[PDB]
Amino acid sequence: QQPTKTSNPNDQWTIKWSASDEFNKNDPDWAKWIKTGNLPNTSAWKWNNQKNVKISNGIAELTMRHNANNTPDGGTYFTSGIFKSYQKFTYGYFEAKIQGADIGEGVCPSFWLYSDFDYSVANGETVYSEIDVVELQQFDWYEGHQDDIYDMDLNLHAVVKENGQGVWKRPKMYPQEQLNKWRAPWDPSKDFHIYGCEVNQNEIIWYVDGVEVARKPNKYWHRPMNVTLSLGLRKPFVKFFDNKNNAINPETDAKAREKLSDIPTSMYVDYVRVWEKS
Ligand SMILES: [Mg+2]
Numbered sequence: 520q521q522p523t524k525t526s527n528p529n530d531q532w533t534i535k536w537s538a539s540d541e542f543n544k545n546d547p548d549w550a551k552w553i554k555t556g557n558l559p560n561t562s563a564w565k566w567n568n569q570k571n572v573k574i575s576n577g578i579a580e581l582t583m584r585h586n587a588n589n590t591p592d593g594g595t596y597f598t599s600g601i602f603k604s605y606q607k608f609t610y611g612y613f614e615a616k617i618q619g620a621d622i623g624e625g626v627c628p629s630f631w632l633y634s635d636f637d638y639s640v641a642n643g644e645t646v647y648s649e650i651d652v653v654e655l656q657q658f659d660w661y662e663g664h665q666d667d668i669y670d671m672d673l674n675l676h677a678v679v680k681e682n683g684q685g686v687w688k689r690p691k692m693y694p695q696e697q698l699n700k701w702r703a704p705w706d707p708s709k710d711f712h713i714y715g716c717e718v719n720q721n722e723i724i725w726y727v728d729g730v731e732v733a734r735k736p737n738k739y740w741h742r743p744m745n746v747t748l749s750l751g752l753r754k755p756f757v758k759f760f761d762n763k764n765n766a767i768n769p770e771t772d773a774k775a776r777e778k779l780s781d782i783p784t785s786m787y788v789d790y791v792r793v794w795e796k797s
Pocket residue numbers: 542543544545574575576577578
């Protein structure tokens with residue numbers, strides 16, 4: 520198999536099985552994907568891959584579940600599921616075929632690449648690199664525009680060392696360099712579509728169903744990153760302050776309580792494929 524669409528047909532692409540999976544096996548491949556431990560810091564929910572990852576008939580299912588009895592675990596009320604490659608990559612092509620979640624608003628099916636934090640690097644250097652190949656169903660609010668289910672985000676995030684500190688460079692702070700939004704003509708929660716990203720030393724280009732939808736210069740995104748599919752929690756179950764999702768107790772908020780009838784909810788992934796340019 521090859522990348523659906525690339526910027527230069529003269530390039531050659533070699534599939535990298537260390538972060539590619541057609542999910543034809545019902546036993547998740549925990550040699551390839553990190554089951555526990557080394558998973559993203561989430562302040563608003565926890566991961567439970569034993570309970571929240573299932574694969575059936577060629578399709579992986581990642582599920583957001585409400586904790587039994589509404590009992591917090593370390594300040595959080597839900598668990599989710601995540602495929603995080605052990606293998607890191609920097610440049611290459613990354614693609615996943617994904618269908619979103621039936622809840623509509625409240626979770627964020629995501630395909631994304633992220634590094635560790637290296638706070639040792641020199642002034643101006645990158646501490647942390649994150650490329651979001653797609654964030655679905657976030658219902659983001661930006662400059663007075665409220666998104667709905669058809670809108671998606673395709674953003675870059677980094678932390679850069681400045682005057683001794685790691686300073687976050689966020690998409691809404693640097694939108695020309697880092698923010699991408701695209702509106703689909705179909706509801707991403709209802710069917711599978713193909714989300715791709717081509718990453719090289721110069722540029723990062725994003726594709727949806729084989730159409731280029733965004734491109735940005737590669738300013739900071741040169742660190743090794745793990746290939747990630749995960750189902751994130753969003754409002755009404757979280758509330759933003761201090762540059763982080765804070766968990767909301769779904770029994771203390773009407774909007775969160777009424778969405779509980781729609782939990783558990785799942786994203787689905789037919790494949791993930793990674794290539795390197797040869
Ligand atoms: Mg299967």
